[PDB]
Design a protein around this nucleic acid. Sequence first.
DNA 1: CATGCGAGTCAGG
DNA 2: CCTGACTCGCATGA
Length: 580
Amino acid sequence: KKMAFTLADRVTEEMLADKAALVVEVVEENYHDAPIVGIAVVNEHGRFFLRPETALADPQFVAWLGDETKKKSMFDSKRAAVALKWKGIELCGVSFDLLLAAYLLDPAQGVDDVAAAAKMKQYEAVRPDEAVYGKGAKRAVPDEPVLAEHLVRKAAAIWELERPFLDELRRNEQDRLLVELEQPLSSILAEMEFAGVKVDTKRLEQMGKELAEQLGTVEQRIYELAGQEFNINSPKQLGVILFEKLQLPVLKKTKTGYSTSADVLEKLAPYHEIVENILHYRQLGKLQSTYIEGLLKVVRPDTKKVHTIFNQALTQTGRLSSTEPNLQNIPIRLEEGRKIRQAFVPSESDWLIFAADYSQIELRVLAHIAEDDNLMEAFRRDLDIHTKTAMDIFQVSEDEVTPNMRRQAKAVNFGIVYGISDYGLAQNLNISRKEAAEFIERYFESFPGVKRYMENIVQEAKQKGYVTTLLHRRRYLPDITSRNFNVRSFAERMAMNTPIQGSAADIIKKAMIDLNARLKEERLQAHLLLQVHDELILEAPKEEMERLCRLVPEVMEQAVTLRVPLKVDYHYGSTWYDAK
DNA sequence: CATGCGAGTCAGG
DNA sequence: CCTGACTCGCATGA
Ligand SMILES: OC[C@@H]1O[C@](CO)(O[C@H]2O[C@H](CO)[C@@H](O)[C@H](O)[C@H]2O)[C@@H](O)[C@@H]1O
Ligand SMILES: OC[C@H]1O[C@@](CO)(O[C@H]2O[C@H](CO)[C@@H](O)[C@H](O)[C@H]2O)[C@H](O)[C@H]1O
Ligand SMILES: [Mg+2]
């Protein structure tokens, strides 16, 4: 049965009630400077559909949109807020976001549209967006009649589902997480995405030029060493050259054939000169295709900025993700790749990039949650945690710790967080299970509180069916009861890791909210540009750097109070590369 | 041919 | 281990 609604030709007062479900539809995946194809409003007076050209030109409607006292319930309000920012219109008063509500209730559900969130509460009187708009090449906005009914049905679903969702969040003790953390954060991410990051395209194009030269040279050397030309970028073709023509040993296989991953190649290097060259080719090729060409493809030519989109409702841990471009994985480990950061510059003359990052926030969080006396004391002394871990597991003094000892202790720490097992650490340390197991055993002997936490959290996940973070985010782990060792083991590692990675995500999100309020109170022009899991990147006038050096670290360090101090390091410079 | 996606790979925290 | 993007190449549609 069709849903009744008014297809309005003009805005009326009853459409501007102080409480309503609102839909501002942006069909394009990337909503930056994208079209708004329709608007739907559902409130106590009825259901309405408005053409965007009409609504967005109406002074009363625009005022209503920007009035914080007029409350709106939506799905993915960031999408609408950003689409509206590009049109110079402010969206305020969003008191409920169904996408974020659904995400907090169960990140694993993968809610990507109103229909999916609605199905969680047995509401199915709304179609999935994909069914209405089609996919990819066939994607298209349907005729007004079909479009209007769909938007009205989505607004109707939001109108009906708000209460049930808030009720469950309340029962889960997640009501404040939604209202005081995720929703306010959504507005901050919208501002960051809209601001964008300026790119020195001339710089990137030059790096690409010289990179192309080097690739050409290495490519030729590889053909020479192989005795023939082939597609180096083809694992299948490369596998034939290495394991058949050159007879290199096969130490690892993939589900489909020979493995040619960097890990395997490093072990084969001593057998043939072609290996080192392939690894070098892989490094430069990655930079060229992904960080030079790929980046240049998404830079807006009129502003020379990239406008990422942060997915706030995707990860099972509470972390954000970044797309088009992904600004959370720009090279930094190797110097050649790190230079790519010289292309990310301040958006204004005489401005600088400021970057602040938490020092070992995940391990500090673990010290707090597990209440491990040894680990807490370590951070209270602000010790080098890897050297300290080495001292304890190997039973040696500080000056007796060798570089390799610290390297292995660091690997244990890198893993301990991710609940890593004997077979997981072994690969990273290129050792055996029995040995790796003894390392973990030694770690627990030194950090008994951590061992107790790992045992207790797994039992809790089994008992409750989920684990939680410091700010009450949750993750259900149904596989925790599986009778399949591998499946159960993974769930166990997730039970151990989620409260750690998840609580660290909670902390930085809270820091972002606190920071934005502080920047406004101080009327600084400085603003957030990016978040990379445990670090915040801002840009500001050079005349604000000294103030930011004291302000940003303090706000980040004071976001939450743990049993151990939080420590933040910071740097600033002319480019993101220099902010080191 | 065009479109699209699983596999393999590798970048970050 | 949490993510996203790029290549290649078998697969399939309009
Ligand atoms: O001593 C703890 C005791 O063992 C428990 C099993 O009986 O088991 C937990 O840990 C093992 C791995 O060590 C997993 O295989 C089980 O699934 C997990 O429940 C627990 O029930 C009890 O407290
Ligand atoms: O939090 C984001 C929210 O949007 C969804 C809707 O399906 O993602 C859409 O937009 C992003 C950014 O452009 C794309 O990467 C996705 O492909 C597109 O579906 C996501 O599922 C939901 O959580
Ligand atoms: Mg750090």
